[PDB]
Amino acid sequence: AWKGEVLANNEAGQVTSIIYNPGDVITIVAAGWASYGPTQKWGPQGDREHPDQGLICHDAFCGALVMKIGNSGTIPVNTGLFRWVAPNNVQGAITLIYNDVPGTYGNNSGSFSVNIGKDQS
Amino acid sequence: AWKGEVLANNEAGQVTSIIYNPGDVITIVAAGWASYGPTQKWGPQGDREHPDQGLICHDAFCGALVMKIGNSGTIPVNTGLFRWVAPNNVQGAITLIYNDVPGTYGNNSGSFSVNIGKDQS
Amino acid sequence: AWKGEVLANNEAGQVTSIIYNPGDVITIVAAGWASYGPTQKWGPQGDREHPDQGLICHDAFCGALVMKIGNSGTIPVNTGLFRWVAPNNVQGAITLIYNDVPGTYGNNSGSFSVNIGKDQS
Amino acid sequence: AWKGEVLANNEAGQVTSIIYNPGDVITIVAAGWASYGPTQKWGPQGDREHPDQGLICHDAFCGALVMKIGNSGTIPVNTGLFRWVAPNNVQGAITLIYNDVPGTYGNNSGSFSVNIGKDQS
């Protein structure tokens, strides 16, 4: 497995050591508190009242945990994925990233605590 | 494995199909939006700015997902648990409950979508 | 998980540390060589030639690996079970037993090595 | 997971849908009854008395289940493998084969029924 944290102020995210391979089934659980600027904080689902101003992942809220698998596009994680299989032609290293607008991460705060593991398949 | 809805306005909480037995490893993932009152909603982590006024679980925030296993006291689930094991002498049916004050549930809204699986042991 | 030996000469069988509970998925791998008398040895499938002169388990061959879960009747194991769910309402510690006629086990030699683990469910 | 048959009378052996990847843990269970010629049938451990007259796998008996993983040599499976990891740098598609002398597979009858799954990491 992989266990670690994902800094909200870190625009490259965390490249993990989970290589997602065709047919792999994975589980992710994410927890904690983060902000894209305000003194208030939101968890891994992000802020459902905030509008999308050019976020790296449009299918999730600002301040939400999202991921890339290899050189795929962003994919929402939020609180987690349970026994999840990826779509066709998606494979490689799982990278985790705070969902925010490129260029704006400098005042972010907090982090998410995240566990990833491969399940039986 | 079990998947189902935990309604925030359900004071007795949602009984699952999971009997937790000694030695079991389980993984929970919970997602969704709920309110204990206001028009604003919060996820399974609850509202970190709201006071504890007699919550059924003092170890989580108001509006957090929690649970009981058989006769146990409430245990925080929040966003979930990864490859988790119960304390010795904790066993029985998992009930999943919105963390709120007893007798205040009638105004509550929305729900959490929750996965529970047992993992390899 | 559990790993140990099942002696061919033991009528009482070997109690393991696996408690089978309802809904449990289990895997068993059995290996090795044993005899109920003759100078030849057979593996954990037993002897396909030989008649059932009063075997503790009538649905496996003589010399095959079998099991009880709790105080159940015998259940065939043979070379192993792969992500197997009990068809019944059956619960308790798995005991492993070499299938043979009671009283005759004095002729027997050898043993199987056996692994059991609970899979994800 | 994959479930299928390896024909004893098939020299090329059966290619599976399982692609072994770095860090994969796999479980295999094999069962059934096959001969390499004689009228007696032996299970996936094979015949422990029959001598080795030029076998594709020298580390299992004639009549035993063995396998290649991509470009590796033959590796013994026999009755199975429990939460098993592959040797340094072994990867690719898993093929299951009846261990025998390359040229003689026409003599054979019967088959092994086989399940392969990946386990948790």
Side-chain angles (χ1 to χ4, degrees):
Chain A
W2 190 86
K3 184 223 230 157
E5 298 87 37
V6 171
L7 263 36
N9 77 4
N10 179 24
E11 160 144 38
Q14 282 294 7
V15 186
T16 80
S17 54
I18 306 301
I19 309 319
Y20 189 86
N21 293 305
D24 271 354
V25 175
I26 64 167
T27 286
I28 308 181
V29 186
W33 292 116
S35 182
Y36 50 86
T39 50
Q40 175 174 194
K41 288 188 179 128
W42 298 260
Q45 300 182 132
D47 176 4
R48 74 203 284 275
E49 269 151 30
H50 197 64
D52 173 344
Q53 325 196 111
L55 298 161
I56 60 167
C57 196
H58 298 291
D59 193 8
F61 296 129
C62 186
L65 175 72
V66 302
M67 79 176 172
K68 306 214 206 199
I69 292 167
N71 58 13
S72 89
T74 40
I75 295 164
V77 174
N78 300 296
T79 70
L81 303 172
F82 187 83
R83 272 113 195 241
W84 182 87
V85 185
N88 282 327
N89 192 55
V90 173
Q91 65 172 82
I94 305 192
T95 295
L96 307 164
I97 325 168
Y98 193 66
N99 190 32
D100 207 347
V101 182
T104 78
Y105 283 63
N107 267 322
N108 295 355
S109 49
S111 65
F112 295 143
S113 180
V114 183
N115 266 285
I116 307 169
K118 296 196 201 208
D119 300 316
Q120 307 186 321
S121 69
Chain B
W2 180 89
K3 191 191 202 217
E5 275 322 305
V6 192
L7 263 73
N9 77 162
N10 183 10
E11 157 142 37
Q14 184 57 61
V15 56
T16 72
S17 80
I18 309 262
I19 325 254
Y20 183 90
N21 312 305
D24 286 347
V25 190
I26 74 177
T27 287
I28 313 195
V29 167
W33 301 106
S35 177
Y36 53 88
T39 29
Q40 193 185 354
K41 308 206 200 273
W42 293 265
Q45 293 201 121
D47 178 2
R48 63 199 288 266
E49 314 182 324
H50 197 50
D52 183 339
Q53 287 171 335
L55 300 155
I56 58 155
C57 184
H58 307 313
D59 277 5
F61 294 126
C62 180
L65 181 61
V66 307
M67 75 168 169
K68 292 183 173 159
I69 305 190
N71 291 303
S72 79
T74 54
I75 303 152
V77 172
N78 296 308
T79 54
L81 317 162
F82 184 86
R83 292 172 194 181
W84 186 89
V85 181
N88 286 343
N89 294 281
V90 181
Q91 65 191 76
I94 302 177
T95 298
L96 294 168
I97 316 145
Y98 195 72
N99 195 22
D100 207 359
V101 179
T104 70
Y105 286 73
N107 277 349
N108 291 2
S109 52
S111 48
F112 296 147
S113 187
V114 199
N115 280 283
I116 308 189
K118 307 190 171 185
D119 307 306
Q120 215 184 264
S121 61
Chain C
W2 177 94
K3 139 148 239 165
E5 310 278 278
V6 177
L7 267 64
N9 70 16
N10 199 347
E11 268 183 57
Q14 176 70 66
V15 196
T16 73
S17 54
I18 314 306
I19 311 295
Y20 188 86
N21 301 302
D24 275 352
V25 179
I26 51 151
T27 295
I28 308 184
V29 174
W33 298 107
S35 177
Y36 58 93
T39 350
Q40 183 184 159
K41 270 162 166 106
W42 296 262
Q45 297 201 111
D47 187 315
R48 45 169 358 229
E49 331 262 28
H50 210 225
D52 154 13
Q53 304 167 285
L55 292 183
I56 58 169
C57 187
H58 300 286
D59 347 301
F61 300 129
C62 181
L65 175 60
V66 301
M67 68 171 183
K68 286 157 166 166
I69 298 197
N71 304 100
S72 87
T74 43
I75 295 150
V77 179
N78 293 316
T79 63
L81 301 185
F82 179 89
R83 305 190 174 166
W84 173 98
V85 191
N88 296 307
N89 197 192
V90 108
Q91 188 286 344
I94 298 180
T95 291
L96 305 162
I97 318 176
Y98 187 80
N99 199 25
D100 206 357
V101 185
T104 64
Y105 283 69
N107 312 298
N108 304 358
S109 58
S111 60
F112 307 133
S113 155
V114 180
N115 284 285
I116 304 174
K118 284 186 183 190
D119 305 289
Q120 104 182 358
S121 65
Chain D
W2 184 88
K3 189 242 220 298
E5 318 189 276
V6 206
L7 274 323
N9 84 340
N10 193 329
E11 178 161 356
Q14 190 61 53
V15 75
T16 73
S17 66
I18 301 302
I19 309 274
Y20 190 93
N21 305 319
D24 279 356
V25 189
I26 58 172
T27 283
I28 308 185
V29 189
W33 291 111
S35 187
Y36 59 82
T39 2
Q40 194 191 348
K41 259 140 201 68
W42 305 262
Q45 293 194 122
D47 193 347
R48 62 170 276 215
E49 293 162 350
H50 196 87
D52 173 3
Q53 313 182 279
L55 295 168
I56 61 173
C57 192
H58 293 290
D59 310 323
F61 300 128
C62 167
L65 188 71
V66 309
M67 87 192 152
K68 283 150 180 244
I69 293 182
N71 60 338
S72 67
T74 49
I75 301 166
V77 182
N78 304 118
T79 60
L81 290 175
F82 182 94
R83 312 185 178 166
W84 180 85
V85 194
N88 205 61
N89 223 147
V90 161
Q91 72 190 280
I94 298 194
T95 306
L96 313 168
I97 321 127
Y98 194 71
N99 202 22
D100 215 345
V101 168
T104 86
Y105 285 75
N107 296 287
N108 305 354
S109 60
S111 48
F112 303 140
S113 164
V114 187
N115 286 102
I116 310 174
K118 312 212 177 160
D119 299 315
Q120 299 193 344
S121 340

PDB file of all heavy atoms in Angstrom, chain A residues 50-79:
ATOM      1  N   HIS A  50     -18.538  26.791  -3.797  1.00  0.00           N
ATOM      2  CA  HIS A  50     -17.553  27.561  -4.555  1.00  0.00           C
ATOM      3  C   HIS A  50     -17.715  27.258  -6.047  1.00  0.00           C
ATOM      4  O   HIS A  50     -17.992  26.118  -6.420  1.00  0.00           O
ATOM      5  CB  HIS A  50     -16.117  27.313  -4.081  1.00  0.00           C
ATOM      6  CG  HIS A  50     -15.143  28.361  -4.548  1.00  0.00           C
ATOM      7  ND1 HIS A  50     -15.225  29.683  -4.161  1.00  0.00           N
ATOM      8  CD2 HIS A  50     -14.090  28.286  -5.399  1.00  0.00           C
ATOM      9  CE1 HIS A  50     -14.263  30.372  -4.750  1.00  0.00           C
ATOM     10  NE2 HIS A  50     -13.557  29.547  -5.500  1.00  0.00           N
ATOM     11  N   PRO A  51     -17.652  28.289  -6.899  1.00  0.00           N
ATOM     12  CA  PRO A  51     -17.728  28.059  -8.350  1.00  0.00           C
ATOM     13  C   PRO A  51     -16.364  27.664  -8.929  1.00  0.00           C
ATOM     14  O   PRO A  51     -15.308  27.970  -8.377  1.00  0.00           O
ATOM     15  CB  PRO A  51     -18.214  29.413  -8.914  1.00  0.00           C
ATOM     16  CG  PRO A  51     -17.910  30.450  -7.827  1.00  0.00           C
ATOM     17  CD  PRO A  51     -17.546  29.726  -6.579  1.00  0.00           C
ATOM     18  N   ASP A  52     -16.430  26.963 -10.040  1.00  0.00           N
ATOM     19  CA  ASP A  52     -15.285  26.454 -10.752  1.00  0.00           C
ATOM     20  C   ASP A  52     -14.701  27.623 -11.560  1.00  0.00           C
ATOM     21  O   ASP A  52     -15.358  28.087 -12.473  1.00  0.00           O
ATOM     22  CB  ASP A  52     -15.800  25.311 -11.659  1.00  0.00           C
ATOM     23  CG  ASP A  52     -14.736  24.768 -12.602  1.00  0.00           C
ATOM     24  OD1 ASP A  52     -13.710  25.465 -12.770  1.00  0.00           O
ATOM     25  OD2 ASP A  52     -14.867  23.685 -13.242  1.00  0.00           O
ATOM     26  N   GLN A  53     -13.503  28.111 -11.233  1.00  0.00           N
ATOM     27  CA  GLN A  53     -12.881  29.223 -11.984  1.00  0.00           C
ATOM     28  C   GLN A  53     -11.726  28.779 -12.916  1.00  0.00           C
ATOM     29  O   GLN A  53     -10.797  29.529 -13.121  1.00  0.00           O
ATOM     30  CB  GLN A  53     -12.373  30.315 -11.018  1.00  0.00           C
ATOM     31  CG  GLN A  53     -13.255  30.501  -9.768  1.00  0.00           C
ATOM     32  CD  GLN A  53     -12.994  31.808  -9.001  1.00  0.00           C
ATOM     33  OE1 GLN A  53     -13.851  32.693  -9.000  1.00  0.00           O
ATOM     34  NE2 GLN A  53     -11.822  31.924  -8.350  1.00  0.00           N
ATOM     35  N   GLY A  54     -11.827  27.592 -13.503  1.00  0.00           N
ATOM     36  CA  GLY A  54     -10.733  26.935 -14.210  1.00  0.00           C
ATOM     37  C   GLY A  54      -9.955  25.875 -13.409  1.00  0.00           C
ATOM     38  O   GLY A  54      -8.729  25.834 -13.464  1.00  0.00           O
ATOM     39  N   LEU A  55     -10.659  25.026 -12.662  1.00  0.00           N
ATOM     40  CA  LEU A  55     -10.034  24.001 -11.828  1.00  0.00           C
ATOM     41  C   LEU A  55      -9.398  22.878 -12.662  1.00  0.00           C
ATOM     42  O   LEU A  55      -9.887  22.554 -13.752  1.00  0.00           O
ATOM     43  CB  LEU A  55     -11.072  23.407 -10.862  1.00  0.00           C
ATOM     44  CG  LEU A  55     -11.720  24.365  -9.829  1.00  0.00           C
ATOM     45  CD1 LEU A  55     -13.023  23.787  -9.284  1.00  0.00           C
ATOM     46  CD2 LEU A  55     -10.803  24.680  -8.689  1.00  0.00           C
ATOM     47  N   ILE A  56      -8.310  22.279 -12.159  1.00  0.00           N
ATOM     48  CA  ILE A  56      -7.712  21.114 -12.832  1.00  0.00           C
ATOM     49  C   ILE A  56      -8.697  19.937 -13.003  1.00  0.00           C
ATOM     50  O   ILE A  56      -8.581  19.178 -13.967  1.00  0.00           O
ATOM     51  CB  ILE A  56      -6.409  20.645 -12.139  1.00  0.00           C
ATOM     52  CG1 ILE A  56      -6.670  20.253 -10.694  1.00  0.00           C
ATOM     53  CG2 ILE A  56      -5.349  21.734 -12.207  1.00  0.00           C
ATOM     54  CD1 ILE A  56      -5.533  19.508 -10.079  1.00  0.00           C
ATOM     55  N   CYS A  57      -9.659  19.796 -12.079  1.00  0.00           N
ATOM     56  CA  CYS A  57     -10.760  18.840 -12.189  1.00  0.00           C
ATOM     57  C   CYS A  57     -12.116  19.527 -12.062  1.00  0.00           C
ATOM     58  O   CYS A  57     -12.517  19.968 -10.955  1.00  0.00           O
ATOM     59  CB  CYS A  57     -10.680  17.752 -11.135  1.00  0.00           C
ATOM     60  SG  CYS A  57     -11.744  16.330 -11.559  1.00  0.00           S
ATOM     61  N   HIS A  58     -12.830  19.565 -13.194  1.00  0.00           N
ATOM     62  CA  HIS A  58     -14.145  20.180 -13.308  1.00  0.00           C
ATOM     63  C   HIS A  58     -15.245  19.299 -12.769  1.00  0.00           C
ATOM     64  O   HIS A  58     -16.370  19.796 -12.543  1.00  0.00           O
ATOM     65  CB  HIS A  58     -14.467  20.493 -14.758  1.00  0.00           C
ATOM     66  CG  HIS A  58     -13.519  21.467 -15.364  1.00  0.00           C
ATOM     67  ND1 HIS A  58     -13.478  22.792 -14.989  1.00  0.00           N
ATOM     68  CD2 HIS A  58     -12.547  21.305 -16.296  1.00  0.00           C
ATOM     69  CE1 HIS A  58     -12.539  23.409 -15.682  1.00  0.00           C
ATOM     70  NE2 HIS A  58     -11.962  22.529 -16.484  1.00  0.00           N
ATOM     71  N   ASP A  59     -14.949  18.006 -12.581  1.00  0.00           N
ATOM     72  CA  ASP A  59     -15.972  17.092 -12.099  1.00  0.00           C
ATOM     73  C   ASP A  59     -15.842  16.955 -10.585  1.00  0.00           C
ATOM     74  O   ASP A  59     -16.304  15.989  -9.999  1.00  0.00           O
ATOM     75  CB  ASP A  59     -15.917  15.746 -12.857  1.00  0.00           C
ATOM     76  CG  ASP A  59     -17.189  14.834 -12.605  1.00  0.00           C
ATOM     77  OD1 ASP A  59     -18.200  15.266 -11.972  1.00  0.00           O
ATOM     78  OD2 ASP A  59     -17.244  13.639 -13.003  1.00  0.00           O
ATOM     79  N   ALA A  60     -15.212  17.937  -9.949  1.00  0.00           N
ATOM     80  CA  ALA A  60     -15.150  17.991  -8.494  1.00  0.00           C
ATOM     81  C   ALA A  60     -15.101  19.417  -7.999  1.00  0.00           C
ATOM     82  O   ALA A  60     -14.772  20.326  -8.736  1.00  0.00           O
ATOM     83  CB  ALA A  60     -13.935  17.228  -7.978  1.00  0.00           C
ATOM     84  N   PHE A  61     -15.416  19.600  -6.732  1.00  0.00           N
ATOM     85  CA  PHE A  61     -15.410  20.916  -6.158  1.00  0.00           C
ATOM     86  C   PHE A  61     -14.001  21.387  -5.856  1.00  0.00           C
ATOM     87  O   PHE A  61     -13.067  20.616  -5.677  1.00  0.00           O
ATOM     88  CB  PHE A  61     -16.269  20.978  -4.904  1.00  0.00           C
ATOM     89  CG  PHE A  61     -17.749  20.719  -5.157  1.00  0.00           C
ATOM     90  CD1 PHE A  61     -18.438  19.772  -4.409  1.00  0.00           C
ATOM     91  CD2 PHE A  61     -18.453  21.416  -6.156  1.00  0.00           C
ATOM     92  CE1 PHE A  61     -19.818  19.525  -4.629  1.00  0.00           C
ATOM     93  CE2 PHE A  61     -19.845  21.166  -6.381  1.00  0.00           C
ATOM     94  CZ  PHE A  61     -20.513  20.221  -5.624  1.00  0.00           C
ATOM     95  N   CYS A  62     -13.870  22.695  -5.839  1.00  0.00           N
ATOM     96  CA  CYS A  62     -12.680  23.346  -5.419  1.00  0.00           C
ATOM     97  C   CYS A  62     -12.387  22.890  -4.012  1.00  0.00           C
ATOM     98  O   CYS A  62     -13.239  22.918  -3.139  1.00  0.00           O
ATOM     99  CB  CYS A  62     -12.909  24.851  -5.479  1.00  0.00           C
ATOM    100  SG  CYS A  62     -11.451  25.843  -5.135  1.00  0.00           S
ATOM    101  N   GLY A  63     -11.164  22.457  -3.799  1.00  0.00           N
ATOM    102  CA  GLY A  63     -10.718  22.035  -2.485  1.00  0.00           C
ATOM    103  C   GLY A  63     -10.884  20.538  -2.290  1.00  0.00           C
ATOM    104  O   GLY A  63     -10.609  20.041  -1.200  1.00  0.00           O
ATOM    105  N   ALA A  64     -11.301  19.839  -3.346  1.00  0.00           N
ATOM    106  CA  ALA A  64     -11.527  18.389  -3.317  1.00  0.00           C
ATOM    107  C   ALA A  64     -10.270  17.626  -3.762  1.00  0.00           C
ATOM    108  O   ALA A  64      -9.483  18.125  -4.562  1.00  0.00           O
ATOM    109  CB  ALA A  64     -12.681  18.021  -4.229  1.00  0.00           C
ATOM    110  N   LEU A  65     -10.111  16.410  -3.267  1.00  0.00           N
ATOM    111  CA  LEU A  65      -8.986  15.568  -3.619  1.00  0.00           C
ATOM    112  C   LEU A  65      -9.298  14.950  -4.974  1.00  0.00           C
ATOM    113  O   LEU A  65     -10.380  14.431  -5.196  1.00  0.00           O
ATOM    114  CB  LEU A  65      -8.740  14.508  -2.536  1.00  0.00           C
ATOM    115  CG  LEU A  65      -7.646  13.469  -2.853  1.00  0.00           C
ATOM    116  CD1 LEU A  65      -6.322  14.094  -2.772  1.00  0.00           C
ATOM    117  CD2 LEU A  65      -7.676  12.162  -2.014  1.00  0.00           C
ATOM    118  N   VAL A  66      -8.367  15.029  -5.902  1.00  0.00           N
ATOM    119  CA  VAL A  66      -8.526  14.406  -7.214  1.00  0.00           C
ATOM    120  C   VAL A  66      -7.224  13.712  -7.558  1.00  0.00           C
ATOM    121  O   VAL A  66      -6.232  13.841  -6.824  1.00  0.00           O
ATOM    122  CB  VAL A  66      -8.845  15.446  -8.308  1.00  0.00           C
ATOM    123  CG1 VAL A  66     -10.103  16.195  -7.958  1.00  0.00           C
ATOM    124  CG2 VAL A  66      -7.697  16.427  -8.481  1.00  0.00           C
ATOM    125  N   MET A  67      -7.198  12.995  -8.681  1.00  0.00           N
ATOM    126  CA  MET A  67      -6.020  12.216  -9.021  1.00  0.00           C
ATOM    127  C   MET A  67      -5.792  12.121 -10.503  1.00  0.00           C
ATOM    128  O   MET A  67      -6.707  12.301 -11.295  1.00  0.00           O
ATOM    129  CB  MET A  67      -6.118  10.809  -8.422  1.00  0.00           C
ATOM    130  CG  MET A  67      -7.015   9.852  -9.197  1.00  0.00           C
ATOM    131  SD  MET A  67      -6.988   8.206  -8.513  1.00  0.00           S
ATOM    132  CE  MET A  67      -8.319   7.377  -9.474  1.00  0.00           C
ATOM    133  N   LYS A  68      -4.546  11.865 -10.869  1.00  0.00           N
ATOM    134  CA  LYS A  68      -4.181  11.421 -12.201  1.00  0.00           C
ATOM    135  C   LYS A  68      -3.579  10.029 -12.080  1.00  0.00           C
ATOM    136  O   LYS A  68      -3.009   9.665 -11.017  1.00  0.00           O
ATOM    137  CB  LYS A  68      -3.150  12.363 -12.801  1.00  0.00           C
ATOM    138  CG  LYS A  68      -3.562  13.863 -12.816  1.00  0.00           C
ATOM    139  CD  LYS A  68      -3.008  14.600 -14.066  1.00  0.00           C
ATOM    140  CE  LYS A  68      -2.823  16.087 -13.845  1.00  0.00           C
ATOM    141  NZ  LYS A  68      -2.734  16.816 -15.152  1.00  0.00           N
ATOM    142  N   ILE A  69      -3.762   9.238 -13.140  1.00  0.00           N
ATOM    143  CA  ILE A  69      -3.197   7.898 -13.266  1.00  0.00           C
ATOM    144  C   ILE A  69      -2.379   7.910 -14.537  1.00  0.00           C
ATOM    145  O   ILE A  69      -2.927   8.039 -15.634  1.00  0.00           O
ATOM    146  CB  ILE A  69      -4.294   6.830 -13.346  1.00  0.00           C
ATOM    147  CG1 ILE A  69      -5.035   6.705 -12.022  1.00  0.00           C
ATOM    148  CG2 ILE A  69      -3.716   5.476 -13.752  1.00  0.00           C
ATOM    149  CD1 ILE A  69      -6.315   5.901 -12.157  1.00  0.00           C
ATOM    150  N   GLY A  70      -1.065   7.788 -14.389  1.00  0.00           N
ATOM    151  CA  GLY A  70      -0.146   8.098 -15.473  1.00  0.00           C
ATOM    152  C   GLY A  70      -0.320   9.528 -15.979  1.00  0.00           C
ATOM    153  O   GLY A  70      -0.232  10.486 -15.200  1.00  0.00           O
ATOM    154  N   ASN A  71      -0.591   9.660 -17.278  1.00  0.00           N
ATOM    155  CA  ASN A  71      -0.721  10.968 -17.928  1.00  0.00           C
ATOM    156  C   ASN A  71      -2.194  11.183 -18.359  1.00  0.00           C
ATOM    157  O   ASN A  71      -2.476  11.920 -19.299  1.00  0.00           O
ATOM    158  CB  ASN A  71       0.264  11.086 -19.114  1.00  0.00           C
ATOM    159  CG  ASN A  71       0.059   9.974 -20.185  1.00  0.00           C
ATOM    160  OD1 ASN A  71      -0.963   9.238 -20.193  1.00  0.00           O
ATOM    161  ND2 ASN A  71       1.034   9.861 -21.100  1.00  0.00           N
ATOM    162  N   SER A  72      -3.107  10.516 -17.640  1.00  0.00           N
ATOM    163  CA  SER A  72      -4.544  10.734 -17.770  1.00  0.00           C
ATOM    164  C   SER A  72      -4.924  12.127 -17.321  1.00  0.00           C
ATOM    165  O   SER A  72      -4.122  12.856 -16.712  1.00  0.00           O
ATOM    166  CB  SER A  72      -5.336   9.714 -16.920  1.00  0.00           C
ATOM    167  OG  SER A  72      -5.560  10.181 -15.577  1.00  0.00           O
ATOM    168  N   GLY A  73      -6.165  12.481 -17.621  1.00  0.00           N
ATOM    169  CA  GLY A  73      -6.789  13.668 -17.073  1.00  0.00           C
ATOM    170  C   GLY A  73      -7.175  13.471 -15.611  1.00  0.00           C
ATOM    171  O   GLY A  73      -7.061  12.387 -15.046  1.00  0.00           O
ATOM    172  N   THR A  74      -7.652  14.535 -14.993  1.00  0.00           N
ATOM    173  CA  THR A  74      -7.974  14.479 -13.597  1.00  0.00           C
ATOM    174  C   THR A  74      -9.158  13.570 -13.379  1.00  0.00           C
ATOM    175  O   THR A  74     -10.008  13.444 -14.227  1.00  0.00           O
ATOM    176  CB  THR A  74      -8.257  15.871 -13.052  1.00  0.00           C
ATOM    177  OG1 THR A  74      -9.010  16.605 -14.014  1.00  0.00           O
ATOM    178  CG2 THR A  74      -6.987  16.658 -12.942  1.00  0.00           C
ATOM    179  N   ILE A  75      -9.178  12.925 -12.220  1.00  0.00           N
ATOM    180  CA  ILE A  75     -10.268  12.041 -11.831  1.00  0.00           C
ATOM    181  C   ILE A  75     -10.619  12.275 -10.352  1.00  0.00           C
ATOM    182  O   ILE A  75      -9.730  12.233  -9.482  1.00  0.00           O
ATOM    183  CB  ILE A  75      -9.854  10.616 -12.054  1.00  0.00           C
ATOM    184  CG1 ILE A  75      -9.638  10.376 -13.541  1.00  0.00           C
ATOM    185  CG2 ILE A  75     -10.910   9.623 -11.473  1.00  0.00           C
ATOM    186  CD1 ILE A  75      -8.859   9.103 -13.833  1.00  0.00           C
ATOM    187  N   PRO A  76     -11.897  12.481 -10.048  1.00  0.00           N
ATOM    188  CA  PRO A  76     -12.267  12.822  -8.658  1.00  0.00           C
ATOM    189  C   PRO A  76     -12.062  11.644  -7.711  1.00  0.00           C
ATOM    190  O   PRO A  76     -12.273  10.494  -8.071  1.00  0.00           O
ATOM    191  CB  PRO A  76     -13.746  13.251  -8.732  1.00  0.00           C
ATOM    192  CG  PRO A  76     -14.180  13.126 -10.206  1.00  0.00           C
ATOM    193  CD  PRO A  76     -13.066  12.361 -10.940  1.00  0.00           C
ATOM    194  N   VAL A  77     -11.578  11.955  -6.521  1.00  0.00           N
ATOM    195  CA  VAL A  77     -11.404  10.998  -5.465  1.00  0.00           C
ATOM    196  C   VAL A  77     -12.386  11.382  -4.343  1.00  0.00           C
ATOM    197  O   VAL A  77     -13.181  10.544  -3.886  1.00  0.00           O
ATOM    198  CB  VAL A  77      -9.953  11.008  -4.968  1.00  0.00           C
ATOM    199  CG1 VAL A  77      -9.784  10.096  -3.737  1.00  0.00           C
ATOM    200  CG2 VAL A  77      -8.985  10.593  -6.122  1.00  0.00           C
ATOM    201  N   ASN A  78     -12.343  12.644  -3.941  1.00  0.00           N
ATOM    202  CA  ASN A  78     -13.159  13.197  -2.855  1.00  0.00           C
ATOM    203  C   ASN A  78     -12.786  12.454  -1.566  1.00  0.00           C
ATOM    204  O   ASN A  78     -11.588  12.377  -1.235  1.00  0.00           O
ATOM    205  CB  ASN A  78     -14.676  13.124  -3.140  1.00  0.00           C
ATOM    206  CG  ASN A  78     -15.084  13.889  -4.382  1.00  0.00           C
ATOM    207  OD1 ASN A  78     -14.947  15.100  -4.448  1.00  0.00           O
ATOM    208  ND2 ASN A  78     -15.591  13.176  -5.377  1.00  0.00           N
ATOM    209  N   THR A  79     -13.781  11.872  -0.875  1.00  0.00           N
ATOM    210  CA  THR A  79     -13.498  11.121   0.335  1.00  0.00           C
ATOM    211  C   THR A  79     -12.804   9.799   0.054  1.00  0.00           C
ATOM    212  O   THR A  79     -12.194   9.223   0.944  1.00  0.00           O
ATOM    213  CB  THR A  79     -14.753  10.845   1.178  1.00  0.00           C
ATOM    214  OG1 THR A  79     -15.592   9.903   0.497  1.00  0.00           O
ATOM    215  CG2 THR A  79     -15.583  12.117   1.410  1.00  0.00           C
TER     216      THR A  79
END
